[PDB]
Structure formats: C-alpha cells, structure tokens
Amino acid sequence: VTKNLTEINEQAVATKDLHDVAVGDVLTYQVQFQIPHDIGALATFKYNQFKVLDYMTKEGLTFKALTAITVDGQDILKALTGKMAFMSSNDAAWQQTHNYPFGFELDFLGGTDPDAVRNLLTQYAGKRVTVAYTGIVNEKMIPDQKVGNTAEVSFDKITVNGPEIQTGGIRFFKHEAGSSKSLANATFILQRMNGNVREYAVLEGVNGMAGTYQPTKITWTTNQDAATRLKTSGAETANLTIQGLLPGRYTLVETAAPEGYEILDPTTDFEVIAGTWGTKTIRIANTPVN
Ligand SMILES: [Cl-]
C-alpha cells in the first residue's frame, strides 16, 4: 500500500515526504493497493470486506471529495458509486465512529451491492487500484506543526503513512517609535513578487477580524485596490499576525498610519520560514505627531 500527495490546486507537485501548503489549497492524494488475485473466490465468498480507512490525528484539513478510483487506466468510480460503504469527516456520524478530525472510510464490499462490486473487482484481480481524493487546507492549519495522515487497508490490516504538510505564519508588533506602546488601527497590505509580477493578498474569511488573521483562503491579485487591508489591534505582544502562508519573501506595505501618527517604514521586507512563525516577531515603529 502506498500513499502520496500528488497535486496542489490541480497542479502536479514533486513527490517528497514534506510539503509546504497555503490555507485554502486543495490537496490531491492517492492511496494505491492491490486487488487480491482471488478477490472473486468462494470461501459464501472468501472476501466480504475490502476497506480503506484514511485519517489524520491533527487538525488542518477538511475532506473535499472522493475524486477517482482507477485501475489499469480505467476510472471505475462511476460504476461503483452508490454500491459501497462510504463515510467522511464531513458526515455527522464520523466523530463518534472514528475519533479523528479528518478522514474517510471506504468499504468496497460493505455497501448495499457488494456482489456487483466484487464482480467488478474480479475483472481486475491482481491489479493495483488507486483511490484519489481531495482535501482543503483550513483555518485550523497552524504553523509550527507538521501534520500527516495514515491509511489502512484491510480484509477483516496493512498501514502506511502519507507525507507531512506544514504552513507558515508571521507576527508583527506595531508600536510608537521609542517605546513598546501598541498602536491599533495601522493599515497594511501584504505584497509579494510572483516572478516579475507584483501581487497583493486577498484574504477570504476575515471580515470582522483585526490584528489576528486566520483566513480560509489567501489569493493574489494584481489590483492593489482589491488587496485586503489588514489592521493592527491594540494587543500587547503581537498586534498583527497572519497564518497560512507559503515560505518565501514578502513585503508588508503600510498604506495608512494610525490617527496621530505618520508612517516611518512604508515597506517592511520579511521572510516566511517554512513551517514556522518565523525567527521573531517583527517590530515596526510609527512616528507620533500628536
Ligand atoms: Cl514584494
């Protein structure tokens, strides 16, 4: 049995055991295993269960869809749909059945029509079958945490672990020049260079948030006026934080100082460090003028 993360946002990615992800990313996984050569055999059938359980013990992914079940280049999901047993972590029964924040269980022979399913699998006896599915990186995917999954295949088991995923974040502390006084209501936008194209962050799911940003998705625009205006809180230690970012270079661009202040540093260049909140909370001064 194998498990791999094969795509991010429907683009193929290189196989490795650790991937950096952004919040809102759609991750494609594949779990592959062999149909027994004697899947069709009489013992009354020898096989009455053919189960795939896939789960994560840590938060950060929401189940999206079972996308394909393929063998020998043939997608057989259309033929199998409605005949099998299936539950995911989106279903109300999941938590009490399998106490994990993410996962699914597919029992090829546990549904209403196991004979039909067994007959189909018998056409591909001894061949490798791939179950593909997607998940969505959600607002509970926090930095400083590598999270992985486990798949188990059983006929009454074999277990494998998938790759780990992680995300980045950053913290700033906007303050009055010369002191540690927290300044609320400074306005920033988040900028990056994607190749030679300057782009700005659009955060979904952050209406009503200030200071702490925990978006459900981050996309990028070349229309600067469409960028989400991020606001500092008056909090003590870090009054602007963002999570769910890919590693690399960014610029925090100050578009308005708080009332009674002027901008000192229009641009703050910084790095997101893969999988972490970064080296330190980045202090940014504003100049008092009242
Ligand atoms: Cl930039």
Residue numbers in the entry: 184 to 226, 232 to 344, 348 to 481
Paper text:
The L. rhamnosus GG genome also carries the genes for another pilus operon called spaFED9. The tertiary organization of GG-SpaD is a tandem assembly of three Ig-like domains, wherein a middle domain (M-domain) joins together the N- and C-terminal regions (N- and C-domains) of the pilin subunit.
We also solved a GG-SpaD structure where only the M- and C-domains are present (GG-SpaDMC). The crystal structure of GG-SpaDMC, which contains just the M- and C-domains, was initially obtained at resolution 1.5 Å. Among the backbone pilins with a triple- or quadruple-domain structure, the N-domain is usually seen as the most flexible in nature, and thus, in many instances, its removal from the rest of the protein is needed for obtaining good X-ray-diffracting crystals. Generally, this explains why the N-domain degrades while undergoing crystallization or does not form crystals at all.
